Every structure is written in structure tokens, then in C-alpha cells.
Amino acid sequence: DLADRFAELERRYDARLGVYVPATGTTAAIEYRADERFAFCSTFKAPLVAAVLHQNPLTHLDKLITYTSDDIRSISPVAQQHVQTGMTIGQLCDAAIRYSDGTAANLLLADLGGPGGGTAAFTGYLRSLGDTVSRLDAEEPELNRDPPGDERDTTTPHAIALVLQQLVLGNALPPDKRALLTDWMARNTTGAKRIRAGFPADWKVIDKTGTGDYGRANDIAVVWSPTGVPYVVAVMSDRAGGGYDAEPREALLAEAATCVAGVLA
Numbered sequence: 112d113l114a115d116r117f118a119e120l121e122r123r124y125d126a127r128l129g130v131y132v133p134a135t136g137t138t139a140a141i142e143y144r145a146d147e148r149f150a151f152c153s154t155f156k157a158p159l160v161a162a163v164l165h166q167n168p169l170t171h172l173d174k175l176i177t178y179t180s181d182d183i184r185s186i187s188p189v190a191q192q193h194v195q196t197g198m199t200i201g202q203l204c205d206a207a208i209r210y211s212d213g214t215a216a217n218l219l220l221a222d223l224g225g226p227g228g229g230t231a232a233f234t235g236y237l238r239s240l241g242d243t244v245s246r247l248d249a250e251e252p253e254l255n256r257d258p259p260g261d262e263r264d265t266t267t268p269h270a271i272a273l274v275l276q277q278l279v280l281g282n283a284l285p286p287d288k289r290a291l292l293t294d295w296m297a298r299n300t301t302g303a304k305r306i307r308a309g310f311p312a313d314w315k316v317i318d319k320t321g322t323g324d325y326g327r328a329n330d331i332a333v334v335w336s337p338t339g340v341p342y343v344v345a346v347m348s349d350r351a352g353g354g355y356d357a358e359p360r361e362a363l364l365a366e367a368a369t370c371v372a373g374v375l376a
């Protein structure tokens with residue numbers, strides 16, 4: 112029984128675990144705390160990039176964005192190295208997804224524009240995909256400071272799964288923008304010990320991770336079986352029982368993904 116395995120893992124890592132895999136083909140939906148709210152953490156960066164792709168011509172990717180010291184306010188492995196020359200929208204999308212670059216995320220939010228520094232339009236983008244649940248209320252690094260239970264800056268494994276399904280497998284984006292998003296998530300550098308670690312090597316995996324205080328660790332992915340059958344896999348977790356300093360545990364998400372992969376094989 113799968114719900115039993117997920118419960119075992121919660122006890123092992125002193126964690127709250129949320130899992131959703133949408134129903135597809137002759138495969139039933141997998142769901143565990145799938146409608147409870149979990150912090151986005153950095154996972155929002157993937158649909159952010161979709162929002163910015165949708166809103167503009169693909170030529171927009173080549174627009175150069177300049178920024179400086181007081182824009183670097185969060186973990187920003189790529190933006191910190193290019194601050195003197197600036198970065199193109201394209202480079203920023205690349206960094207936001209592949210290195211979870213926070214400054215890139217803020218600059219892309221600003222590019223979207225409108226109230227809340229972009230966060231309202233980010234949310235409106237999800238609403239356009241039929242996601243009535245998720246909300247982004249702040250940008251980096253403030254979006255990470257909400258305590259356990261706080262509804263600000265949250266999604267649900269169910270909500271973000273259906274969003275990612277439309278973005279990557281569905282027609283939320285035209286093919287050329289869709290490929291750009293898909294390719295960036297394929298080339299993700301941060302996700303090796305999470306959902307990717309639970310699936311056999313001959314499965315293709317693309318993903319965006321999230322991490323936070325209170326032991327938050329997320330991963331949202333699309334996986335393809337060796338015969339090309341795709342599944343969307345959303346895994347979210349926290350370990351709020353250990354307080355603000357509780358360490359995120361990637362192994363939890365890797366074990367949860369192993370349980371899911373065995374069921375989808």
C-alpha cells in the first residue's frame with residue numbers, strides 16, 4: 112500500500128509529505144496530502160519562466176537586463192557573476208530554472224510587471240491555467256520567510272502538478288516556447304538527489320526544485336518512461352517539527368519518488 116509507505120517516510124524524517132501524480136492513460140492518480148498547502152519555495156521559478164515566455168515574442172529573450180548591488184538579495188549563483196555586464200531575459204530564465212537563481216527570479220517578476228512587483232501577474236498566470244489555489248505574495252527572499260501553516264506563497268501538490276502538466280505536456284504554451292521551458296528543466300543542475308534519484312536511468316526526468324527553512328524540500332517533475340509515456344510528479348515536504356533550523360532532507364523526496372516509480376513502471 113502506497114499511503115502506508117508515504118506515512119512510514121513521514122515518521123522516518125519527522126516530516127509532512129505531499130505527493131501528486133495526475134491520472135493518465137490507464138494509470139490512476141497518485142495522491143497523498145495532495146490538497147494540503149506547502150510553501151512554493153523556489154519551484155515557482157518554473158511557471159514564472161512560462162509566464163514570461165507566454166507574455167512576449169520569443170525575440171524578447173535577447174533583451175538585456177541591467178542590475179546592480181541592491182538587486183542581489185538572495186541566493187543567485189549566476190546573476191552574481193554577470194552583474195557588471197547585465198543578463199538577457201533568456202539568460203535569466205536559464206538561471207532561474209537551472210541554478211534556482213533568486214535575482215533572476217526577481218528580475219523576471221519585474222519584467223512581468225504590475226502590482227506586487229510582478230507577483231500578482233504571476234498569480235494571474237496560474238489562474239489562467241485554471242489553478243485557483245496557488246498564490247505568490249512576495250519575491251525573493253521574502254517569499255521564504257512564511258512560517259509553517261501560513262497560506263502565503265503556497266501551492267498544493269495537486270495544483271502545481273496540473274499546472275506543470277499543461278505547461279510541458281499540454282498546450283498552455285506554443286511548441287517553440289514549450290520546448291525552451293522543457294529544455295531548461297531537463298538541464299536542471301539542482302535536482303539530482305530528488306525525483307531523478309527515484310527513477311531508473313532509462314527514464315527521462317526534467318524538474319525544478321525548492322528548498323526552505325523548516326526543512327522544506329520540494330521537487331516538481333515530468334518523467335518519461337522508456338517507451339515515451341509521460342507522468343507529472345509533484346513532491347513537497349517540510350519538517351516543521353524541528354523548527355526554523357530543521358535541515359531539508361533530499362533523501363525523503365528520493366525515497367518518495369522511488370515508491371512512485373515502482374507503481375508507474
Ligand SMILES: O=C(O)[C@@H]1CS[C@H]([C@H]2C[C@@H]3CCSCN3N2)[C@@H](CO)CN1
Pocket residue numbers: 152153154184185186187211213251252255320321322323324
Ligand atoms: O535566496 C534565498 O535565500 C532563498 C532561500 S530558500 C531556497 C534555497 C535554499 C537552498 C540552500 C543552498 S543553495 C540553494 N538554496 N536554495 C531557495 C529555493 O528553494 C530560495 N532562495
